[PDB]
């Protein structure tokens, strides 16, 4: 049996147990993935690799993560691109920016990506997002094109609490976002 | 106000045995500040 | 509040959340630091840095660790050198082997070391070890000459369960080794 | 049921950096033995 667990309630200026990529850095005891500026990417990864499944036993891990985040846009119409929680190879590096959320490169299923992300998408990219143009929560596996989506109404500058859980026995990934 | 989504995703078919987890956010022609305030994680893998 | 936790109840051949140094490696469900071979040094580090105290607030962390280990020697007479659990700078590298146990380089105090180790020493090095010649548990801070030691009788080839706990309220480090 | 305990006051904040790595080492020299760890559990909390 293997477990990895951690919690960070307040981010310090030098949070050495995280790998920062792009413009991600910590400030005012928050992890700032992007500032309100055009064309940026910011990522932050937990430093330890996590053992999610094992080929010699075939067992697969359960996991739970919860975090609070804020999207702070000028007005609730001028806002893009969104935020992701992702699971990727140990060597992951920023991929395409903009509507691909720094995590994928195509709307075409790419088996070499081997990353799944839960996105909180604020900008409608016509080529792959739900036709209705809404903001949404979606589950992505190997492409920016979600396998499934739920419309979500952004509350600008409001903190959202999210829990994401995966249970190996049922292979069910559960996403929950609440604005309190 | 809550929003929930549930899906069956057999992770074993998609991700390597060892992974790094994390957050990502971007802006493009349009923008917003994206910030995380706290983060709890726990995984358990039977052997 | 920041928390870091993990357990590895059984080590597999691909243990990517450990950093291996010198000749330490993982095999047959075991982490092996040394084989029963002359002149070797093996170390294994957890991959995540852990925040042990904070200068902004002056708080220091509480932590507890448990592990079980085996020393297997040709016989009970010719046994050397020992085993350590240590805490050290993030960029720590193997130091002198043999009696220095891979973590220190001198019996002289050196604050540049910034390493504290709990050692389970099986060989008596006359220059710094207890003059009674006993195998001993010791607490080392910045030198291989322990600031306190306790005599221990090695049961060769038997597993020992160790618990090390630090209490930040009192700054006391407690070590207990138990054979069944 | 054979045990050995050692207690000692060690103000870690004076000796070690704020951020550390933890781990195990073992050595042999002109004499030797196999040194193996079978399991490891750790938990820290910093307020
Ligand atoms: C209009 O296209 C650009 O801006 C949008 C919105 O930020 C991103 O999705 C996109 O990939 C480009 O950056
Ligand atoms: C004889 O001296 C050598 O061997 C002993 C026992 O292994 C070590 O303690 C010491 O550092 C030297 O390497
Ligand atoms: Ca989009
Ligand atoms: Ca010795
Ligand atoms: Mn989308
Ligand atoms: Mn000693």
Care to describe what's here?
The complex is a heterotetramer, with 2 copies of chain A (180 residues) and 2 copies of chain B (47 residues). Chain A is mostly beta strands. Chain A has one domain (1-180): Jelly Rolls (Sandwich), CATH 2.60.120.200. Chain A contains no helices and 13 strands. Chain A has strands at 2-8, 18-22, 25-27, 30-34, 41-46, 50-51, 62-72, 82-89, 116-121, 136-141, 148-151, 159-167, 172-178. A 4-stranded antiparallel sheet of chain A has the order 8-9-10-11, with no helix packed on it. Chain A has a 3-stranded antiparallel sheet with strand order 7-12-13, with no helix packed on it. With 47 residues, chain B is mostly beta strands. Chain B has one domain (1-47). Chain B is 9% helix and 62% strand. Chain B starts with a strand and ends with a strand. The relative contact order of chain B is 0.13. The chains are: A mainly beta (180), B mainly beta (47). Chains in contact: A-B, A-C, B-C, C-D. Chains C and D meet through strand 1, strand 2, strand 4, strand 5 and strand 6 of C and strand 1, strand 2 and strand 3 of D. Residues 81-82, 99, 121, 123-125, 129 of chain C line the site of one calcium ion (CA). The PDB classes it as lectin. Keywords: lectin. It forms a tetrameric assembly. Three-dimensional structures of complexes of lathyrus ochrus isolectin I with glucose and mannose: fine specificity of the monosaccharide-binding site. Chains A, C: legume isolectin I (alpha chain).
């Amino acid at each position: 049996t293997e477990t990895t667990s951690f919690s960070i309630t307040k981010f310090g200026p030098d949070q050495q147990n995280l790998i920062f990529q792009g413009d991600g850095y910590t400030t005012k005891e928050r992890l700032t993935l992007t500032k309100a500026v055009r064309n940026t990417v910011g990522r932050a990864l937990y430093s330890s690799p996590i053992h999610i499944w094992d080929s010699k036993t075939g067992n697969v891990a359960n996991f739970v993560t919860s975090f609070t985040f804020v999207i702070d846009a000028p007005n609730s119409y001028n806002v893009a691109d969104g935020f992701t929680f992702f699971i990727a190879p140990v060597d992951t590096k920023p991929q395409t920016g903009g509507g691909y959320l720094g995590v994928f490169n195509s709307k075409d299923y790419d088996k070499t990506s081997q990353t799944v992300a839960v996105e909180f998408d604020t900008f409608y990219n016509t080529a792959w997002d739900p036709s209705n143009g809404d903001r949404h929560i979606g589950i992505d596996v190997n492409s920016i094109k979600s396998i499934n989506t739920k419309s979500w109404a952004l509350q600008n500058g409001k903190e959202a609490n999210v829990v994401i859980a995966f249970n190996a026995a049922t292979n069910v990934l559960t996403v929950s976002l609440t604005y309190p | 106000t809550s929003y929930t989504l549930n899906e069956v995703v057999p992770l074993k078919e998609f991700v390597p045995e060892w992974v790094r987890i994390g957050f990502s956010a971007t802006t493009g022609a349009e923008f917003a500040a994206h910030e995380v305030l706290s983060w709890y994680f726990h995984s358990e893998l039977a052997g």
